[PDB]
Design an enzyme around this catalytic site. Sequence first.
Site, short mmCIF file in Angstrom:
data_model
loop_
_atom_site.label_atom_id
_atom_site.label_comp_id
_atom_site.label_asym_id
_atom_site.label_seq_id
_atom_site.Cartn_x
_atom_site.Cartn_y
_atom_site.Cartn_z
N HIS A 62 8.08 -0.97 5.93
CA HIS A 62 8.02 -0.01 4.80
C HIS A 62 7.03 1.64 6.17
CE1 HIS A 62 8.13 -1.25 1.14
NE2 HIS A 62 7.09 -2.65 1.97
N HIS A 92 -1.42 2.89 10.49
CA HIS A 92 -0.05 3.39 11.07
C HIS A 92 -0.01 4.38 10.43
CE1 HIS A 92 -2.08 2.26 7.00
NE2 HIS A 92 -0.46 3.21 6.85
N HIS A 94 2.41 7.68 9.11
CA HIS A 94 3.79 8.14 7.99
C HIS A 94 4.30 8.96 8.18
CE1 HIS A 94 1.83 5.59 4.66
NE2 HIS A 94 0.95 6.17 5.82
N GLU A 104 0.57 12.95 4.07
CA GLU A 104 0.72 12.07 2.70
C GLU A 104 -0.61 13.11 2.07
OE1 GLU A 104 -0.32 7.78 2.55
OE2 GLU A 104 1.87 7.87 1.72
N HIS A 117 -3.12 6.32 10.00
CA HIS A 117 -4.18 6.15 8.78
C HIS A 117 -4.53 5.13 9.60
CE1 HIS A 117 -2.16 8.35 5.15
NE2 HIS A 117 -3.14 8.62 5.25
N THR A 196 -2.46 4.52 0.20
CA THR A 196 -1.47 5.47 -0.75
C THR A 196 -0.32 4.73 -0.99
OG1 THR A 196 -0.68 5.71 1.05
CG2 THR A 196 -2.51 7.25 0.64
N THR A 197 0.34 2.83 -0.63
CA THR A 197 1.22 2.57 -0.60
C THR A 197 0.85 1.28 -1.95
OG1 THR A 197 0.46 -0.13 0.76
CG2 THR A 197 2.11 2.31 1.80
#
EC number: 4.2.1.1
Length: 258
Positions: A62, A92, A94, A104, A117, A196-197
């Site tokens: 992911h 991590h 995005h 995000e 994040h 958010t996941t």
Amino acid sequence: HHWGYGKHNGPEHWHKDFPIAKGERQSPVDIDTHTAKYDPSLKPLSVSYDQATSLRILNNGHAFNVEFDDSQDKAVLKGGPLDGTYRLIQFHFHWGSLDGQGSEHTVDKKKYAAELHLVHWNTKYGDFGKAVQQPDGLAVLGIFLKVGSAKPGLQKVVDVLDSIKTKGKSADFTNFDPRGLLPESLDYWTYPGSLTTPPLLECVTWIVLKEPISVSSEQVLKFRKLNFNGEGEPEELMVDNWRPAQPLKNRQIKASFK
Ligand SMILES: CCCCNC(=O)c1ccc(Cl)c(S(N)(=O)=O)c1
Ligand code: NA
Ligand SMILES: [Zn+2]
């Protein structure tokens, strides 16, 4: 048929396996800077990352996670809107397929090229797995990335990516200093939200820094060479691994500044 970021399993599908996706405090959100309330009672954020011990970097299919030793009070976030002490467990990112998308959170609808994040758990709950079950379990420090000059403190991360190209790959990743990922200012917005996941748990105090960091085109291009698939499976580039903004519902975003 597990969750991911495509047409058939992306964000608009997650509610079927994780019905909290349509909950009352989901993340991310659009930050409307004119309606965020300045709160003079908010304290400076305290980021104490001098003793951080990174361990490993993992491609989880992911994103990639840089994981830390969270078995002692090293690498803690406190102050700001928080009560008590939160310990860094991983960071991590995005990011997008194109420089015009990838974050995000959004700021007055602006999308950044990526978003970092830094995930921390509240020490009153003893470990991350218990913390995610609590409404004040996690604090995530979110930092936007724009494309421009390189971020020298990012380069060690970018250079190891070739070794974790596919889902399930991991590499030793010690002595990484996450201080080199921070902007100059710690001015921030804050609100109560969620992962958010999946599993989208409503356990996060979000702290989003106003000042983005700059990374180079070359650095973000190397993120986009990662794969969502495993080794020996058909190549799906790891891009556009962001959830879009969710309804604010009954929440107020607070600003530490202006
Ligand atoms: C099942 C793990 C999937 C990957 N997602 C993560 O590793 C992940 C863990 C915790 C948090 Cl707070 C977040 S985020 N994006 O910061 O809300 C993501
Ligand atoms: Na460039
Ligand atoms: Zn994240």
